[PDB]
Each structure stands twice: as structure tokens, then as C-alpha cells.
Amino acid sequence: QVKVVKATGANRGIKGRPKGVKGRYKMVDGRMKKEMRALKRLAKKKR
Amino acid sequence: KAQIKQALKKLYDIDTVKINTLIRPDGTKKAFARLTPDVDALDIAATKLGLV
Amino acid sequence: GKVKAGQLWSKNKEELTKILGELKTELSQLRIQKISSSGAKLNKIHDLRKSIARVLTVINAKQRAQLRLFYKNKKYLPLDLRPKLTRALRRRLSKEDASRVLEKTKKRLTHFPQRKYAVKA
Amino acid sequence: SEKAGHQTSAESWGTGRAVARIPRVSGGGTHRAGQGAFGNMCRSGRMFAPTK
Amino acid sequence: MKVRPTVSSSRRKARKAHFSAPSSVRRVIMSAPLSKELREKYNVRSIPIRKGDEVQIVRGAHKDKEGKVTSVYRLKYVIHVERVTREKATGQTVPIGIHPSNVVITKLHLDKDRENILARIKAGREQVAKAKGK
Amino acid sequence: PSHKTFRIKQKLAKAQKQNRPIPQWIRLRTGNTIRYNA
Amino acid sequence: KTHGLCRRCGRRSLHNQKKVCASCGYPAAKTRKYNWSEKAKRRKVTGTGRMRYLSTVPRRFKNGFRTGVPKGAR
Amino acid sequence: RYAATEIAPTKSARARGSYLRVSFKNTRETAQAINGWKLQRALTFLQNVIDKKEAVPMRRYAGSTGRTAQGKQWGVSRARWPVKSAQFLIGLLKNAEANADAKGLDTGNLIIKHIQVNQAPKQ
RNA sequence: AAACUUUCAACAACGGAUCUCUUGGUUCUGGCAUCGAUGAAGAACGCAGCGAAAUGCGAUAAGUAAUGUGAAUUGCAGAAUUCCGUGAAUCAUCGAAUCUUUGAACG
RNA sequence: UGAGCCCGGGUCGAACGGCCUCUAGUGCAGAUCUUGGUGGUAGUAGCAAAUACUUCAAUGAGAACUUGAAGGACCGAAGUG
RNA sequence: GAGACCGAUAGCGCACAAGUAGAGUGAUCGAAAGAUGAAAAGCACUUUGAAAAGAGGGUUAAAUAGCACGUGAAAUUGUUGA
Ligand SMILES: [Zn+2]
């Protein structure tokens, strides 16, 4: 559904839309992986 | 054109048969004043206009 | 080339217009001649330009002085000759209108004014 | 000044871009555009605990 | 110290007013002391400097050079005195600027206007000398 | 285009006047900090 | 182009369809200003211009808005 | 103020140049090829670089640079022909040769005791 | 052995930190009340001997009158000022004027 | 012990320090920190299509891409007018 | 008129021809940029070079103050020495 675009290469430091023409996009980082792991652990330890 | 014709006659005693005008790109007007055949432009320019 | 304002105040209207005509005629002939040999003639241009301004400011000032004498005892003056002040101060009530009091107030101040007194210690 | 450091229009670019989550000046024709603002760590920003 | 509230002892306000002064105020600032002979003659200590004055330089590298003032350059707060000059590279003689506080006036250019200036200063000195005395 | 008004013509006259560089004698004035036209 | 030269504020912000200036509102008698933008207010407040008349009022207040001519003047 | 201050200017001849629009890396290797050389041999070498007869050995700034047989004189394999750097170094050498002529030194015994290429502000 | 890579020193580069300065800002306090149809605030175009901008001014246009001071302005050129004078000045004060096109804008 | 303190040598040119108290916008390696500057990568990747250029002379410090003349190509009136 | 304030990345965005330059159709957004010297005395003259510039010579107390101008750190670079 959504297209995951990396913040690497020609996509580092872009304020807006990258060159991937899609209706919905999500940009991801290394620093998200720390946060997503923390959010997953908090969900696993509270469910 | 009428004001240039009167000013040349009243001040410098210069008769004109035709006056042409353009506005230069600087925003200033340039007037071409052709004289009557009786007078000479070289005589008037040397006498009054101070031009060789 | 420079006229003196002290000389111009003594002269009358016909002499002032003749001098103004002379300066304009002198400037116009020398403006067609300033196209070449721009030297001390340029100082003559600047002096003549200031001289015309001096004759114009004394022609206008004497005319305004005569009009003020004409309108000395007239109810309405031209708007140029009226004092300027501010817009608020021209719509402010006059000194005689602001100081006007009712005659019942004037009678009370006539017979019972504020007195001068002292209290011992 | 109570308005010192707050006279700018800045928004965070986002959380997915490989840049720090600090508000940045919008625009695009200036040196100031894209620069961090509204922080005690930032040049031309707002210092911590403004003096009252 | 200062007493009156209209006076200011601010350093920046004093420096702003000095370097942004009009030429009329700059004339009073560029004043020079009178010589001992002239001081006992007019009972006047100092006067604003003048184009025709004759001065002697008592401070700087051109000490004891005596000459006539030639220019009062009020823009750079300097006076030009005759023959106190330096040479450029091209062998052209250019004048050296001396502050009026470093010179002493040894002769005055006297007109009717200066004579009122000496008179008005002299009147106040003997006014207080009589006030201090009797 | 080829068709203009005089007021538009005078505005374009002023536009090139700002693009003119500064004169050399301004740089030689005492207390001058101007270097070039901007 | 959707905007032309306004005649009151001099900006190229006069709509060619609505004929209303987006910066000042020229056909309106009042000049457009809003309190949610202090930046826009300081860009057009008094002091941003030349002050032909308002710079001469304080000197005339100091001497009491006096008329006439000093005595003995030529 | 030159870098080599141990050499007195009275017995020496010097010439410098600033903000020269030549590649810094090519000029560094060209100045290293002629360091400590005689004046007339260096001028002949630099002209041969222009005419592609002798080559300048590239030692530090020689990444992915081609090989040639003219580097065998220098004991290397990567050697190039910096024509633009050779033109600038000729004019500076002719300038210092003129400075020695004016001062009265002998041009036949002049060696390049010091030569340095420094980085200029970037355009 | 040289070259290359690395370490230290010296000098020279790149760069603009530190130090010192400040006609600026920030905050507090005190005296006073003063925009405009007699055309405001703002916008434009012109004006200097040699000026683009900032500044000043408005075809009397880097300004006129009047008053005061009392001999300059200055980057250059040129006059000045007879200097024992209605009197220099990019001077100050300021009670008289001039005041282009618009803009509440008003054939 | 240590955070640090003090002196010698060079540079530089206008203000600075010890001691006891008072006061604070007071001590940094990190924050994908802010601003500014600088590297390796690296003299590396690369500097396209529109077929095509050549000879003599002139100018100039310097001429493949500046000019004149002469050869060879092209737009082909729905033009590269 | 003042300050137990800040001292050019600080203090107002603006110590400077700053709401300027620039960006956007527009509402609007909006910088960077201070310091030679006491005095320009800001290199006469000679020489090389097409020129830019360089070397002599000169100004200054100081050219280790050349309007790429006070002091001139580190990153990074060059030459020489080990
Ligand atoms: Zn408008």
C-alpha cells in the first residue's frame, strides 16, 4: 500500500516528496529502528 | 510640439518649418527642429548655439 | 552673479519682475552655451539658479504681506494665510468660548470666592 | 526581550529524514532557510530560561 | 561630580556627540590656549581657532615649529599650519594635521567679531574675581 | 513588448540607473565604507 | 499572470479578476492589516517611509505653534 | 615573508605568485620534479613537458593515473604531462632569473634551493 | 637508499577562534502630549559640476527667506571674502515660503 | 594524587591579576545537536544525440571552437528563411 | 537619565546603503556582513613580465599592519629537519 523510502543516497535531507511518485510514502531511518524496537518492547511487555 | 516652436521663436529667434519629437529611453524628450530654407543651420549653431 | 536678499527687500514689484526676467533670460542664453566649456560657467549656473529662487521668495513674501493687510479687518481669510497649527487645535474651542460660564456660576464666584487664609501652629 | 528568538516561522521537517528533529526555517531563497531555530542549542535561537 | 539631571556621564553618548558634531559645535571643540603674553593682555585663556591665527606646536614630533594656520579641517578635527608638512612618495608636499589642543596661539587674527569674543570672556573673569574678592 | 506606456518606459529607465557602478571619488571620501554597487 | 501592479502600496499584488489587492486592499478605503502578523505590521507602519509632514510637527510643538515673525527682521 | 628564512635575500633571487588558477595537485608534483635542480636544466625540462618529451612523476596525487615509459627515468610508472603547471612554473623561473640579472648574480650557477606550492582560497 | 604512509618540530598556507574595542541592542526610571480634506501614514518619479545606494529636498528641487554664530566646505575642479563684511558654512536655530504624480483621494 | 597553578623562549600591542566576601546566561565527546570551516573518496566518476571537418593568410602575448578566401557537408519554402 | 545586562554565532531579524539582498502567483518568508595605521604617509623611481603581478628601492615605531589589511587557534595542506 504505502511505499517505504530510505533516507539514504539522494534522499538524505529532503524536506518533502522524494522522486518516488506514489500516493502515500513513509520515510525511515536508523533512528526509527531504536524507537520502533522500544515501542514493540513496551507493547510486548504490556500485553 | 507647439510649445517647442514658440520657445525657439520667442527666445532664440529661430523659425522652424517642422518639429519632430521622440522620448529617449532615459525618459527625456528629444526634439528635431527643421528650419526655414532662408536661414542656415551652420550660421545659427556657430552664432547662438556655440557649436562648431 | 549672486543677488543679495538685502537689496531685494528695498525694491518694488516692477523692479523685481524686471530682475527676475533678466535672470531667466541670462540663464536661458547661458544654458544653450553651457554645452561646451563647462568650467567657471557652471558656478554661474548655480549662482543664477539660487538668485531666481531668492527673487521668487521675495516676490511671494511681499504679496502675502499685502494680502494680510487687506484681510486685517475681514472675517474670512484665505486658507494659506490662516494659522496652520494641528487639525485638533483648529477644532478646539476658542479661549472665549472655553472660559464662558453661566451667570449663576458667575454670581457665586463674585460673592463667595476662594479666600486666602493661614492656620497657626 | 520576551520575543527574542521567537520572531521566526519554523517547523520540524519530520522523523524519517536523516536530519535532527529541530524546527527549521521555511523558505528557500536565503541562507536562513532550513536552519535550526527555537532552541538554546541553536544560533539565533532562544536561550534556556529567559531572564525576567 | 555632576549634579544637574540634564547632564549625562554616559561614555557612548559623549562619544556619539563628539564624532557626530555639527561644524558649529566642532569650532568650539577645536580651541587652543593663548600664549602667556596674550593671557596677561586680554585676561583670556583659550579661544576657538581661526584661519589667520599664528600658532606654535608644543606637543608631537613637530614640537617648537612656529607658523601661520592655513586650514581648519573641522571634518578630521585638525588644523594645518604653514611649513609643517611631510612629503608623499611622489615628492609632493602634503600637510600634516595637528590637533588644536597641541598648539598655543601666539598671534591672533583680529576683527570686530574676535574683539567681542575677548571682551565677553574677559568680562566674566573679572566678575567672579570681584565676587571672590569682595 | 513593442507597445508600452511612458510611465512603464520611465520605470525601466530608472531600473538600469541602479545597476550603474559607484564613482571612484566616493571611495576617496573620508569616512567611506562603500566598495561597490549591490 | 494572476497579479498586477497595485497603485497604493506599489507591490505586484493586485488580482486581475477580483481587482482587489492582496497586500493592502486598494479599493477599500482602509489599508489591510491584521494582528496575527506583527511582521506585516512593522513592514508598513509609520517610519517605513519618508515622513514629509509628521517629522515637522514636533519642532512646532516645542515653540508653542507660534505665528508671525521675529521682531526687527528684514 | 618567504618560508625559507635561512637564505639571505642579498645572495639569492626569489619570485612568488598568489591566487594562481592552476590545479594545486599537478603543480605540487611539477615543483617536486624540479626541486634542487639547476636553473637551465629545469627550464629545459618544463618545456619538454609542454612538448610531451619528458614526463613529471606523480607520486602522491597519482590515483588511477596511467602508466608510461618516460617514468623510467624517475624510477616510477605513473607519470603525466602537466602543461598548465609547466607554463606557470616557467614564468616564475624566468622572473627569478631576471631578478638575479638585476642584482648581478650569475645565472649559470643558480639552483632551486626552495620551492613550495601552497593551497589558495577556493573559488 | 629514494619514493609512499605515519609521528614531532620550524616556517609558510587554509580558516576566522581567542583577546581587546564598540556612534548598537536590552531593561528600568523621569518630564511632556504633538498626525490628517489648510490633504496624513504609505507608494512613485525627479533634483548635486563630477552619485549608484542610504540621506535631504520638490521644477525656488543635497534646497529659498528670517534669526543666531562668526570664517569656512573639502575626494577633485572652480569661484569665493576684498578680510574690517548685511557676512563663508554639507553650521545651528526656525515664527516666512516653494511644495511634481498617487494615496482617506475628491471633475 | 588530580582538576589545575606558576616560570623560561618566540609573536603581539592596551589593558590585567592575587586575596576575603557577593552574584550568575559559569565548566561538554557524544544529543541522526546548531552555525561556520575543513578532509579522504579523487585529479576519480564524468565533460551525451543532432553524421564533419580540412588548407592558406590576417589579428593577437597566446587561435580546433576569431576573421577573410578556398574545398567538403547540411536546412530544402510543412526551412536551420 | 541610568544598569552587579549582552559584547559581532552574543544583544532586537537588523552595531554595516536591513525588513536590505534573495524566494514565492500571492498571503508572506527573510539572511550573511564591524576593527590597517597616531597620521594614507595607501609603494616615488628602477627592473622582469601581454597582463595580473613579482623583485629591488621607499613610507612607518612596525609591509612580522599591502585597503585578500589589529591579534591570527584548531581541523586540513606544503617545504625543510629527524
Ligand atoms: Zn496594494
The CA distance from D47 to the nearest CA of chain A, in Å, is: 26
- Give the helix/strand (H/E) hosting F30: none
Written as nine digits, the cell of C46 is: 548655480
Q: C85: left (phi > 0), else alpha (psi -120 to 50), else beta? A: left
Whether any strand I atom is under 7 angstroms from the Cβ of C53: the reply reads yes
Q: Which residues of C touch B12 (CB under 8 A)?
A: 32
Helical axes C13-31 vs C40-70, angle rounded to 10°: 150
Whether E96 and E85 have beta carbons less than 8 Å apart is answered as yes
Pairing of strands E66-73, E78-81: antiparallel
Which of E95, E104, E59, E98 lies closest to E78 in space, CA to CA? Answer: E98
Experimental method: cryo-EM
CA distance E122 to B39: 76
Rounded Cα distance between E93 and A9, Å, is 68
Per-residue CB contacts under 7 A with strand K, chain H residues 53-72: 60
Among all strands, which nt has the closest C1' to A29 (CA)? J32
Best mutation target among A3, A15, A27, A39 (most D Cβ atoms within 10 Å) is: A15
Cα–Cα distances in angstroms (integers) from residue B26 to residues B29, C8, G5, in the given order: 9, 39, 22
Residue C38 phi/psi, 5-degree rounding, is -80, 95
Ligand 1 center to F24 CA (angstroms)? 39
Task: Please give the grid coordinates belonging to residue B40.
Answer: 542656415
- Chain D window 16-35, residues with Cβ within 7 A of nucleic strand I: none
Tell me which DSSP letter residue H120 carries.
P
Q: What H or E segment, with its residue span, contains residue F8?
A: helix F6-18
Interval between CA G11 and ligand 1 midpoint (Å): 6
Compute the distance between CA of residue C60 and CA of residue C56 in angstroms, rounded to an integer: 6
Q: How far, in Å, CA of E8 to CA of E29, rounded?
A: 18
Closest by CA to H48, choosing from H66, H23, H73, is H73
Residue D11 three-state SS: strand
DSSP element (H, E) containing A28: strand A25-28
Q: Return the number of other C-beta atoms located less than 10 Å from residue D10's C-beta.
A: 20
The grid coordinates listed for C113 are 470666592
The angle, 0 to 180 degrees and rounded to 10, between the axes of the packed helices H39-50 and H24-33 is 130
How far apart CA H38 and CA H28 sit, in angstroms, is 18
Degrees to nearest 5, angle at CA E89 with E85 and E92: 50
SS3 F37: coil
Beta strands in E1-134 (DSSP E): 31-33, 46-48, 54-57, 66-73, 78-81, 85-87, 93-95, 103-107
Coil, strand or helix: which one is G35? coil
C-alpha cell at G22: 492582496
From residue E118, alpha-carbon distances to C21, E33, E34, E129 in Å are 47, 13, 11, 17
Resolution reading in Å: 2.7
At residue C119, what are phi and psi to the nearest 5 degrees?
-120, 125
From the list C83, C84, C85, C80, the residue with the least C-alpha distance to C61 is C80
* Residue H79 CB partners (closer than 8 Å, separation 6+): H55, H56, H57, H58, H67, H68, H70, H71
CA of residue F14 relative to chain centroid, distance: 7
**Rg, chain F, Cα only:** 15
C43 CB within 8 Å of a chain B CB: no
3-state SS, residue E55: strand
Nearest CB to A26 within list D16, D18, D24: D16
Amino acid present at G69:
V
Query: Residue H51 carries which side chain, given as an amino acid letter?
Result: D
Query: How far off is chain B from F14, nearest CA to CA, in Å?
Result: 8
| Residue D5, C-beta contacts closer than 8 angstroms, at least 6 positions apart | D37, D38, D44, D45, D46, D47
Helices (H) and strands (E) in chain E, counts: 4, 8
Q: Which of C28, C33, C35 sits opposite B11 (nearest CB)?
A: C28
The x, y and z cell numbers of residue B51, run together, are 557649436
Report the C-alpha gap between D20 and D13 in whole angstroms: 9
> Within a 10 A sphere around the Cβ of E69, how many other Cβ atoms?
22
Residue among E55, E75, E56 at smallest CA distance from E64: E56
- Ranges of H-type helices in chain C: 5-10, 13-31, 40-70, 87-90, 95-98, 103-111
Question: 3-class SS at D41?
Answer: coil
Q: Cα(H99)–Cα(D42) distance, rounded to whole angstroms?
A: 55
Contact E39, E22 (CB under 8 A): no
Asked if the C-beta of F9 comes within 8 angstroms of chain B's C-beta atoms, the answer is: yes
Instruction: Compute the CA torsion angle D20, D22, D27, D29 (nearest 10 deg).
Output: -50
How far C88 CA sits from the closest chain B CA (Å)? 43
G68 assigned ligand-binding residue: no
At F19, is the secondary structure helix, strand, or coil? coil
Q: How distant is C1' of J35 from CA of D42, in Å?
A: 7
Q: How far is CA B46 from CA B16, B31, B36, C33, in A?
A: 17, 19, 17, 11
* Pairing label, strands A3-6, E103-107: unpaired
